[PDB]
Write a protein that binds this DNA or RNA. Structure first.
Ligand SMILES: Nc1ncnc2c1ncn2[C@@H]1O[C@H](COP(=O)(O)OP(=O)(O)OP(O)(O)=S)[C@@H](O)[C@H]1O
Ligand SMILES: Nc1ncnc2c1ncn2[C@@H]1O[C@H](COP(=O)(O)OP(=O)(O)OP(O)(O)=S)[C@@H](O)[C@H]1O
Ligand SMILES: [Mg+2]
Ligand SMILES: [Mg+2]
Lengths: 113, 333, 333, 123
DNA sequence: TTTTTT
């Protein structure tokens, strides 16, 4: 499973893709401390399944204006909330009329070294 | 219409099975008096309370195991003595060749009426137990250290020879041949087990027991007896503080544990357990180390209370009756 | 009525077992003279008193262990010498390859009548022990340093290879095969053991004996022998003060301890035990550093009093007869 | 890397070495190398990210120091917590404000360290 | 099934 950079929250790791549902496609290092309430910590690898269509409630890996992030998706018309899991942080409101918002895949597992 | 035909067919099948296999072959469970559980004393009131039913069941298989000098043989001889005090007949298959008749006599065992056998092989030991069970004249048989139940091939073999699971296979065959015989004869078989360490266990307790897995499945009650302290008379260790945990129970709730004292040359301190349980049931007032019964200060400390109780048997019998009445989960008839 | 039927069935069962397995296969514990415990001297009067029965039980298993240079080999050689003084035959399975015939002869062992063997593997040592036990001509066998009882696979293998508890399996199989033979043959087997550290223990005394858990369960008597100080003739260290704690006892009360002196070239200082045990029983008057006997001031200082005891055999005979009468709790004759 | 049972992230629970399955994870990814996996059951360790239901990778050792996160066993019951040893007393501190440290009286209770926590894998 | 090792 390939590692292709970090996440605003290098090597091939011998991890079975089938362990995740849906199957993980690639792993991302985590840089940040905002995903802590649901167990995603700084430095871990989060698993992503390459897809384009998701619904509300899932924790998703989004790309907002070429910047990568992970948060819980809440879609309401042309307004998206990438809710974080932390008291010290504030949610990132994507006004879906001026910013390009691309779903990259689903967070399906975490791995700590 | 249909239910009447079903009842007729069921009655015909029942009569056929009784004709083929005997009168007691098949019958309704609620009218089968042979399946009732009859319990026998363990020589320890706390252990009787922990077992739930009031002691070890009759006609079953019971395993007792623990580390070295934990009190397995002493507890077993107390069970045998309690069995003999009611007129029952008991047998001891000493496979360790480590039974002391004088010490057995000191515990309350009538040596002159105890059948003792020192088998050469595990097959001979298990066959002796089978014959004693089939006789029906022996109520309790104990097998010392099923870790000493060495197969005939292993005895005839050489040291370092590999007999992979041969003892386990022999133990499984013996349990298969013995369960029904013991149930039929209303005979309690107590297997004493030794503790070994299992290698390669990556998690949990590495402590296993000898004899394979059949004894685990076929034993109605399994006891883990351990030495948890020393009863010292200042600088001389005069007894052992021993805890027995009921790791398996088929006749009451499992995992209840008991604590008592084994005094060298006397056995289980029945009066100490009695005083402790009377305190537990608010029947003996314990102000610090002061034990009193109905206001009358029986003494100070466990040893003094035990001595006073021994000097006054009537209060001992009264407190024992009360404790057996209250704390027993499954009071025997 | 039913009692007579029970007695008849019991008699039939005993007859069946007796015909099947042998005359002495099963019989009541009271009339089994083969189960009587008969002991031999350990070379130390204090150790005999501490053991309770007056010595080490024949037909049983004894494990003696302690730190380095604590006197285990010397103690077992003294036991061998005491046995040989009674016409018995003894064998020394020297597994450590560290036996000195000159020192053994110095301690009183008749070297010409000691069957000394130096096994190449642990299996060879245990097979020799089994052969000696089955022969019936050897009354004492001493297996030196069961830590040196290395399995054959460990010998053929290379250093650094992992043999996960192979010696433990070998020792368990040996004890299984050997307990019955030793009991039937009336042979005392003494396993000398070493002491190793327990890695990552939390509570207390990370001491462990080599060879696994089988010897803990099978040894009738277990001794922890330690050196506690030096005995000096001025500035020359001429002996060692040794304390033996009976950690496990199956023939008498355990946990008693004894203290003696191992003099280099003489072994156990018996007369020092005699003096100390006479003092303990008021047979020898002790006024400060002075010892007296029946009014006669016999000396000052322990060494000079024991030298007196050397000088006159008569009073030594008197006092040893008396102390053996008053302190030996289980006299045989 | 085999999964060999559950470990209590809270009040210790009895657990047995049942090999439920073998998971295709490179043991070398953890330092030191993980020896087995345990299914976490509780939330006393969630502050560091060890949540209920995830697999704690454990490296089988017997010697650990203060401040490490270890898998200990007190009287046949296993738990995971930060170790703090002081003579005859032990403290298995959790990582949670709602939970309290678990004192082990190292004079009456059997206590055995069963490894070191070296990572977490969640499915 | 069988067994600890420092
Ligand atoms: N003859 C005896 N006189 C007095 N105390 C004894 C005697 N024999 C054993 N004991 C002690 O009584 C307690 C009960 O132990 P036992 O039941 O005899 O041994 P065990 O529990 O069967 O374990 P094993 O099989 O000997 S390793 C222990 O503390 C023994 O040291
Ligand atoms: N040939 C000898 N002459 C005199 N003293 C000796 C001799 N060999 C050993 N000793 C000492 O006598 C005491 C008894 O120790 P040993 O007889 O060697 O038994 P041990 O305590 O088991 O020591 P081991 O077997 O070598 S670990 C020790 O203090 C030895 O140093
Ligand atoms: Mg026993
Ligand atoms: Mg030596």
């Amino acid at each position: 499973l390939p590692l292709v950079g970090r996440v605003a929250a290098e090597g091939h790791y011998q991890v079975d893709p089938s362990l995740f549902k849906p199957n993980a496609d690639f792993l991302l290092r985590v840089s940040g401390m905002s995903m802590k309430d649901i167990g995603i910590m700084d430095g871990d690898l989060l698993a992503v399944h390459k897809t384009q269509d998701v619904r509300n409630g899932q924790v998703v890996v989004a790309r907002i204006d070429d910047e990568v992030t992970v948060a819980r998706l809440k879609k309401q018309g042309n307004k998206v909330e990438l809710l974080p899991e932390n008291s010290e942080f504030k949610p990132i409101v994507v006004d879906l009329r001026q910013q390009s918002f691309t779903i990259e895949g689903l967070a399906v597992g975490v791995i700590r070294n | 219409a249909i239910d009447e035909n079903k009842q007729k067919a069921l009655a015909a099948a029942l009569g056929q099975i009784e004709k083929q296999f005997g009168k007691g072959s098949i019958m309704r469970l609620g009218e089968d008096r042979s399946m009732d559980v009859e319990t026998i004393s363990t020589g320890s009131l706390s252990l009787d309370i922990a077992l739930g039913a009031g002691g070890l069941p009759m006609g079953r298989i019971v395993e007792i195991y623990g580390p070295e000098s934990s009190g397995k043989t002493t507890l077993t001889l107390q069970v045998i003595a309690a069995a003999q005090r009611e007129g029952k007949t008991c047998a001891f298959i000493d496979a360790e060749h480590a039974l002391d008749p004088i010490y057995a006599r000191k515990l309350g065992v009538d040596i002159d009426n105890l059948l003792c056998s020192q088998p050469d092989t595990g097959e001979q030991a298990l066959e002796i137990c089978d014959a004693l069970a089939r006789s029906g004249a022996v109520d309790v048989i104990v097998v010392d250290s099923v870790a000493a139940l060495t197969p005939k091939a292993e005895i005839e073999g050489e040291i370092g020879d590999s007999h992979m699971g041969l003892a386990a296979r022999m133990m499984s065959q013996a349990m298969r041949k013995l369960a029904g015989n013991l149930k039929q004869s209303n005979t309690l078989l107590i297997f004493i087990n030794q503790i070994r360490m299992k290698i390669g266990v990556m998690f949990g307790n590495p402590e296993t027991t000898t004899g394979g897995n059949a004894l685990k499945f076929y034993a109605s009650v399994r006891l883990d007896i351990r030495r948890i302290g020393a009863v010292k008379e200042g600088e001389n260790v005069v007894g052992s503080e021993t805890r027995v945990k009921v790791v398996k129970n088929k006749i009451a709730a499992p995992f209840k544990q008991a604590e008592f004292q084994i005094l060298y040359g006397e056995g289980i301190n029945f009066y100490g357990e009695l005083v402790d349980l009377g305190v537990k049931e608010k029947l003996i007032e314990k102000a610090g180390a002061w034990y009193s019964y109905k206001g009358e200060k029986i003494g100070q400390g466990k040893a003094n209370a035990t001595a006073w109780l021994k000097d006054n048997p009537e209060t001992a019998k009264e407190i024992e009756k009360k404790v057996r009445e209250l704390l027993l989960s499954n009071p025997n008839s």
